[PDB]
Design an enzyme around this catalytic site. Sequence first.
Site, mmCIF file in Angstrom:
data_model
loop_
_atom_site.group_PDB
_atom_site.id
_atom_site.type_symbol
_atom_site.label_atom_id
_atom_site.label_comp_id
_atom_site.label_asym_id
_atom_site.label_seq_id
_atom_site.Cartn_x
_atom_site.Cartn_y
_atom_site.Cartn_z
ATOM 1 N N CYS A 158 -9.484 8.729 -9.620
ATOM 2 C CA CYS A 158 -10.577 9.652 -9.299
ATOM 3 C C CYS A 158 -10.164 11.103 -9.349
ATOM 4 O O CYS A 158 -9.446 11.544 -8.468
ATOM 5 C CB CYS A 158 -11.116 9.372 -7.908
ATOM 6 S SG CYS A 158 -12.483 10.510 -7.527
ATOM 7 N N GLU A 217 -29.074 -20.886 12.437
ATOM 8 C CA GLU A 217 -28.037 -21.029 13.453
ATOM 9 C C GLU A 217 -27.112 -22.183 13.170
ATOM 10 O O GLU A 217 -27.452 -23.076 12.444
ATOM 11 C CB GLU A 217 -28.656 -21.149 14.848
ATOM 12 C CG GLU A 217 -27.675 -21.328 16.040
ATOM 13 C CD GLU A 217 -26.639 -20.186 16.226
ATOM 14 O OE1 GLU A 217 -26.116 -19.672 15.221
ATOM 15 O OE2 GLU A 217 -26.298 -19.837 17.387
ATOM 16 N N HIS A 276 -33.006 -13.168 17.022
ATOM 17 C CA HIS A 276 -34.373 -13.464 17.385
ATOM 18 C C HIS A 276 -34.733 -13.067 18.855
ATOM 19 O O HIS A 276 -33.928 -13.301 19.741
ATOM 20 C CB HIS A 276 -34.559 -14.956 17.256
ATOM 21 C CG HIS A 276 -33.686 -15.728 18.159
ATOM 22 N ND1 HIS A 276 -34.091 -16.127 19.418
ATOM 23 C CD2 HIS A 276 -32.444 -16.237 17.978
ATOM 24 C CE1 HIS A 276 -33.130 -16.844 19.978
ATOM 25 N NE2 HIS A 276 -32.108 -16.898 19.139
ATOM 26 N N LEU A 310 -24.478 -14.441 14.358
ATOM 27 C CA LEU A 310 -24.223 -13.052 14.690
ATOM 28 C C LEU A 310 -22.692 -12.822 15.016
ATOM 29 O O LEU A 310 -22.038 -11.945 14.409
ATOM 30 C CB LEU A 310 -25.180 -12.633 15.804
ATOM 31 C CG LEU A 310 -25.295 -11.183 16.270
ATOM 32 C CD1 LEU A 310 -24.590 -10.253 15.289
ATOM 33 C CD2 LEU A 310 -26.763 -10.742 16.526
ATOM 34 N N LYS A 338 -7.431 12.255 6.173
ATOM 35 C CA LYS A 338 -6.058 12.724 6.066
ATOM 36 C C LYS A 338 -5.725 13.704 7.179
ATOM 37 O O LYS A 338 -4.760 13.504 7.923
ATOM 38 C CB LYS A 338 -5.730 13.291 4.663
ATOM 39 C CG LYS A 338 -5.932 12.274 3.493
ATOM 40 C CD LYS A 338 -5.238 10.939 3.809
ATOM 41 C CE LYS A 338 -4.900 10.205 2.574
ATOM 42 N NZ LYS A 338 -4.223 8.972 2.920
ATOM 43 N N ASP A 366 0.793 -1.198 0.000
ATOM 44 C CA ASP A 366 0.000 0.000 0.000
ATOM 45 C C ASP A 366 0.850 1.284 0.000
ATOM 46 O O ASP A 366 1.335 1.742 1.054
ATOM 47 C CB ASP A 366 -0.983 -0.011 1.213
ATOM 48 C CG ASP A 366 -1.835 1.238 1.245
ATOM 49 O OD1 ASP A 366 -2.045 1.713 0.121
ATOM 50 O OD2 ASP A 366 -2.265 1.721 2.332
HETATM 51 N N1 LIG Z 1 -12.702 3.959 -5.302
HETATM 52 C C1 LIG Z 1 -12.560 5.091 -4.595
HETATM 53 N N2 LIG Z 1 -12.307 6.278 -5.209
HETATM 54 C C2 LIG Z 1 -12.171 7.418 -4.466
HETATM 55 N N3 LIG Z 1 -12.293 7.445 -3.118
HETATM 56 C C3 LIG Z 1 -12.532 6.323 -2.423
HETATM 57 C C4 LIG Z 1 -12.690 5.058 -3.134
HETATM 58 N N4 LIG Z 1 -12.944 4.112 -2.203
HETATM 59 C C5 LIG Z 1 -12.951 4.707 -0.962
HETATM 60 N N5 LIG Z 1 -12.694 6.041 -1.110
HETATM 61 C C6 LIG Z 1 -12.607 7.051 -0.056
HETATM 62 O O1 LIG Z 1 -11.256 7.250 0.284
HETATM 63 C C7 LIG Z 1 -11.155 7.675 1.659
HETATM 64 C C8 LIG Z 1 -9.939 7.024 2.321
HETATM 65 O O2 LIG Z 1 -8.747 7.481 1.642
HETATM 66 P P1 LIG Z 1 -7.363 6.651 1.717
HETATM 67 O O3 LIG Z 1 -7.889 5.261 1.543
HETATM 68 O O4 LIG Z 1 -6.615 6.913 3.001
HETATM 69 O O5 LIG Z 1 -6.662 7.206 0.392
HETATM 70 P P2 LIG Z 1 -5.146 6.948 -0.093
HETATM 71 O O6 LIG Z 1 -4.682 5.732 0.684
HETATM 72 O O7 LIG Z 1 -5.400 6.793 -1.619
HETATM 73 O O8 LIG Z 1 -4.365 8.214 0.329
HETATM 74 C C9 LIG Z 1 -12.490 7.331 2.303
HETATM 75 O O9 LIG Z 1 -13.087 8.592 2.560
HETATM 76 C C10 LIG Z 1 -13.280 6.607 1.215
HETATM 77 O O10 LIG Z 1 -14.610 7.089 1.082
HETATM 78 O O1 LIG Z 2 6.187 5.179 -1.962
HETATM 79 P P1 LIG Z 2 5.222 6.263 -2.317
HETATM 80 O O2 LIG Z 2 4.744 6.105 -3.781
HETATM 81 O O3 LIG Z 2 5.738 7.654 -1.902
HETATM 82 O O4 LIG Z 2 3.958 6.141 -1.356
HETATM 83 C C1 LIG Z 2 4.292 5.965 0.032
HETATM 84 C C2 LIG Z 2 3.833 7.281 0.619
HETATM 85 O O5 LIG Z 2 2.442 7.495 0.259
HETATM 86 C C3 LIG Z 2 1.845 8.357 1.234
HETATM 87 C C4 LIG Z 2 1.432 9.617 0.497
HETATM 88 O O6 LIG Z 2 0.260 10.084 1.128
HETATM 89 O O7 LIG Z 2 0.682 7.655 1.689
HETATM 90 P P2 LIG Z 2 -0.282 7.545 3.016
HETATM 91 O O8 LIG Z 2 -1.396 8.557 2.757
HETATM 92 O O9 LIG Z 2 -0.504 6.072 2.765
HETATM 93 O O10 LIG Z 2 0.379 7.733 4.380
HETATM 94 C C5 LIG Z 2 2.958 8.646 2.224
HETATM 95 O O11 LIG Z 2 2.585 8.796 3.566
HETATM 96 C C6 LIG Z 2 3.870 7.458 2.104
HETATM 97 O O12 LIG Z 2 5.128 7.840 2.629
HETATM 98 O O1 LIG Z 3 -21.074 -21.584 20.074
HETATM 99 P P1 LIG Z 3 -21.945 -21.374 21.325
HETATM 100 O O2 LIG Z 3 -21.280 -20.345 22.213
HETATM 101 O O3 LIG Z 3 -22.058 -22.687 22.041
HETATM 102 O O4 LIG Z 3 -23.352 -20.737 20.954
HETATM 103 C C1 LIG Z 3 -24.085 -21.397 19.948
HETATM 104 C C2 LIG Z 3 -25.464 -21.684 20.478
HETATM 105 O O5 LIG Z 3 -26.216 -20.509 20.723
HETATM 106 C C3 LIG Z 3 -27.577 -20.732 20.385
HETATM 107 O O6 LIG Z 3 -27.950 -19.859 19.243
HETATM 108 C C4 LIG Z 3 -28.538 -20.444 21.535
HETATM 109 O O7 LIG Z 3 -27.859 -20.684 22.751
HETATM 110 C C5 LIG Z 3 -27.626 -22.238 20.099
HETATM 111 O O8 LIG Z 3 -28.667 -22.559 19.212
HETATM 112 C C6 LIG Z 3 -26.250 -22.506 19.505
HETATM 113 O O9 LIG Z 3 -25.830 -23.837 19.591
#
Ligand SMILES: Nc1ncnc2c1ncn2[C@@H]1O[C@H](COP(=O)(O)OP(=O)(O)O)[C@@H](O)[C@H]1O
Ligand SMILES: O=P(O)(O)OC[C@H]1O[C@@](CO)(OP(=O)(O)O)[C@@H](O)[C@@H]1O
Ligand SMILES: O=P(O)(O)OC[C@H]1O[C@](O)(CO)[C@@H](O)[C@@H]1O
EC number: 2.7.1.105
Lengths: 440, 440
Positions: free
Chosen positions: A141, A309, A240, A378, A155, A111
């Site tokens: 974008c 479940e 439920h 859940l 940011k 990244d």
């Molecule tokens: N496909 C996308 N194009 C533009 N913005 C996006 C996209 N997906 C998520 N975002 C937005 O980007 C923001 C997060 O930015 P970040 O991921 O830190 O950007 P970068 O890592 O490119 O600097 C969130 O606000 C999210 O809504």
């Molecule tokens: O290696 P490059 O292409 O500079 O990208 C790494 C850099 O990207 C940046 C530029 O914003 O990303 P981030 O927002 O991920 O923290 C810098 O912080 C990071 O040093």
């Molecule tokens: O994995 P655990 O913690 O035993 O919980 C699962 C159990 O919970 C329940 O939804 C209700 O207790 C059961 O039907 C199920 O076996």
Amino acid sequence: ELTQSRVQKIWVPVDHRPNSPTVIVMVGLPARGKTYISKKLTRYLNWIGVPTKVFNVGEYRREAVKQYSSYNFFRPDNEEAMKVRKQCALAALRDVKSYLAKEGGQIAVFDATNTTRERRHMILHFAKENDFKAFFIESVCDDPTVVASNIMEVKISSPDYKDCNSAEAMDDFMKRISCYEASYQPLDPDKCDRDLSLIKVIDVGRRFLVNRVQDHIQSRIVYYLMNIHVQPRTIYLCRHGENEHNLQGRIGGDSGLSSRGKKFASALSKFVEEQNLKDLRVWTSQLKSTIQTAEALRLPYEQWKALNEIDAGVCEELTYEEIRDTYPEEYALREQDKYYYRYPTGESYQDLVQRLEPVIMELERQENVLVICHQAVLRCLLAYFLDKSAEEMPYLKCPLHTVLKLTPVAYGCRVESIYLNVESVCTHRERSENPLMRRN
Amino acid sequence: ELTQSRVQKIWVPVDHRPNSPTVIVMVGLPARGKTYISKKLTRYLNWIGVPTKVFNVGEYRREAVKQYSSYNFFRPDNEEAMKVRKQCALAALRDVKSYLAKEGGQIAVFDATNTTRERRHMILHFAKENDFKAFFIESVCDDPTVVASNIMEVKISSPDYKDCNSAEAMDDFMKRISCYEASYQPLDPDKCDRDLSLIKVIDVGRRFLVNRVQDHIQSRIVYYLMNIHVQPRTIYLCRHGENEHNLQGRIGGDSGLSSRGKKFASALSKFVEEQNLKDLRVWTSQLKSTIQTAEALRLPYEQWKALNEIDAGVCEELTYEEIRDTYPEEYALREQDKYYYRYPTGESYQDLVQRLEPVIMELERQENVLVICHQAVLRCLLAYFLDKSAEEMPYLKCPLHTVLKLTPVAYGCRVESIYLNVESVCTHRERSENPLMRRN
Ligand SMILES: Nc1ncnc2c1ncn2[C@@H]1O[C@H](COP(=O)(O)OP(=O)(O)O)[C@@H](O)[C@H]1O
Ligand SMILES: O=P(O)(O)OC[C@H]1O[C@@](CO)(OP(=O)(O)O)[C@@H](O)[C@@H]1O
Ligand SMILES: O=P(O)(O)OC[C@H]1O[C@](O)(CO)[C@@H](O)[C@@H]1O
Ligand SMILES: Nc1ncnc2c1ncn2[C@@H]1O[C@H](COP(=O)(O)OP(=O)(O)O)[C@@H](O)[C@H]1O
Ligand SMILES: O=P(O)(O)OC[C@H]1O[C@@](CO)(OP(=O)(O)O)[C@@H](O)[C@@H]1O
Ligand SMILES: O=P(O)(O)OC[C@H]1O[C@](O)(CO)[C@@H](O)[C@@H]1O
């Protein structure tokens, strides 16, 4: 001749003693959603059982440079900082190597802006020599409102901008962006990047260009990326209303609501009304007690078998006491390894993950959804939204009569819990705590 | 208050008396795989329970024009034939209307070149006025070897070319293609088709351009389209070698192989060897008898829970006699509606479809695969490959000790059956055949 393993109930051949890891490469100008896609995609992969780790090169930078001061650090003329940035990338790569080849990891998400051919070409060289597949994800974008909004959301409240206000953090980051604009070479699948496996995400997922998917795990990522969005909405999760087997400490079965379970249902109605949601999908299982609960709401609801479940096999309808007594060995095995343990002729938490993935995938596509379900189920969904590991998932607390309300913020989900003030039993069971197999 | 339906075991509210259909539009020059994608995609959709029908405008043409003579019919200057072609399109559309709005159909695949803006614009007008969503799928391929090969595989043996040989059929069809080249306007997602939902499949699925997916069913189609290929390969399907419950007419359970089941396993080994497949994946269930069978092969194999046999709920391990006697009403309900019937606390054929879709989806990505499984499961997969309806699927014949070998030809699959000459019981059960509820 084959023996059945005791925890997972998998048939393995009696042991009578005598593919390629992936580096995912993010591409694009800052504030394009790269980190967001990285974290979210990692969250998904880990939950479905593909071990995945994010390497954010920026965090390497923050570790090597004490305190950030300004965008001057990022200028193309800044030869010392270019040395640090390169070294930061290479150190991240070293870790990727370590993680894919020595730690058990299967996907590494690299990244960084990775905006030049030179940088990508190097990453490729490194994949090649380590025997890693490489896959590229570019976010494009140039809608200024999107870029601006993104800068506001994630940011300006970065550690880089600690002793610093909004307007100047915003101004600084716009200049950091311009630093990268001059030598940004987008992926060109049409000629120069002809042979790279990539997806180019355009205009917040309005449009995709996909090129050479080469395997099971790549096609999944693309499918996933094409189904997530960033529109604001809310996910509600609850069980439920209390049921009759609940009252007798009985697991499983298909019993109806207790009179308290019914009082919860009404309260859930009241709660839903007061949330004032313009639309709302409601999903239930096919077990009676989730459906009776949904009936209290007077809304269209849709039943999913996948939300049923966990299936306790031959322990369906027993009390945990009855389990301890009739199947002490089973009872102990489940306590030892509660995620992977499968009940005889029944399921494990691992199995639930796999039936629930299409539920998760549709949750990602939707807007407002209330999902009414069951304890284990859940836990499994919550683990996905709150990024909980396999090991903590069987133990998450998911009490009766309580809505978990999940709202997207920054890079994941805020959880708020809202109890609707109707009593019930409590079905939560914490984790549980050999001289004679040794000489002393 | 809720009652449990007798066949499907679905809880429905006691009845005490007091979204949008989709037109999929194929786009592209002839011999670009449009019909092939149409049929295959329809096969998939119907099997997962989305009712879908292909409207091939060419078949309308063949119905209205007696005998085809030559590509002259398709020339742009041919005003009479242009009237017939237009009328043919409109008649196909009329049927689409009928099918989406009166017949229960959910997806209609409109299969024609649909190569002009004028034609697409009309189709849009028709969707709009009928309240149908519209989704476009364009196949782009200018590799002459591909086009040529495609013409050899499916065009030259069309009824259009009945009194006609290869070389001149091929020559005629190349001119039919040139007829369409002059006013072919490909989808332009980048400006003019900005607002259309579409996927452009490029170079036999080497590359995709996806634009505005708008719903659950569209994103599925895209996922599917991105996972199928046309490389030559073979799928083998068979059951576990005969097992012990087989010998006692017992359903379900997890019993091991009989001595005949083991003799089948060896034969399956011999059969596999003689097939001379350069690679071969082997998949089994997690039930012992499929795994023991795979062990006979001495090859890497992978176990899938999804391939486990239909779960007979509280009838696991009973004989059909024992079922008739203890649960006559259940026994009769299953006979009435064998696809939808669900066993109590168990499954229906409908459920198997849904657990098997990821198996099908991975089958589509793979090359050579042997899948060793169980009766109901095998029926379900075979129904997908041989395009069998829900109603015929529970009754397909899938005997023990027999490989179904599936090879792609033209628009679907050739099946060859190969029995490995080891006896077993036979577990096949055909369909089964009230005065006192009436006055006379
Ligand atoms: N496909 C996308 N194009 C533009 N913005 C996006 C996209 N997906 C998520 N975002 C937005 O980007 C923001 C997060 O930015 P970040 O991921 O830190 O950007 P970068 O890592 O490119 O600097 C969130 O606000 C999210 O809504
Ligand atoms: O290696 P490059 O292409 O500079 O990208 C790494 C850099 O990207 C940046 C530029 O914003 O990303 P981030 O927002 O991920 O923290 C810098 O912080 C990071 O040093
Ligand atoms: O994995 P655990 O913690 O035993 O919980 C699962 C159990 O919970 C329940 O939804 C209700 O207790 C059961 O039907 C199920 O076996
Ligand atoms: N994406 C594709 N691009 C080119 N050819 C394809 C594609 N998919 C399938 N085919 C081939 O197309 C042939 C079938 O052609 P058909 O579907 O009748 O073409 P059309 O309907 O475009 O005239 C098969 O040989 C199949 O291999
Ligand atoms: O409406 P248009 O765009 O002509 O396409 C329909 C025509 O396409 C053709 C051209 O080949 O397809 P097919 O191969 O489907 O039979 C004609 O047979 C059919 O009459
Ligand atoms: O749907 P049918 O025709 O009853 O066949 C399914 C049965 O076949 C078996 O695979 C073996 O007879 C059983 O385990 C399963 O219940």
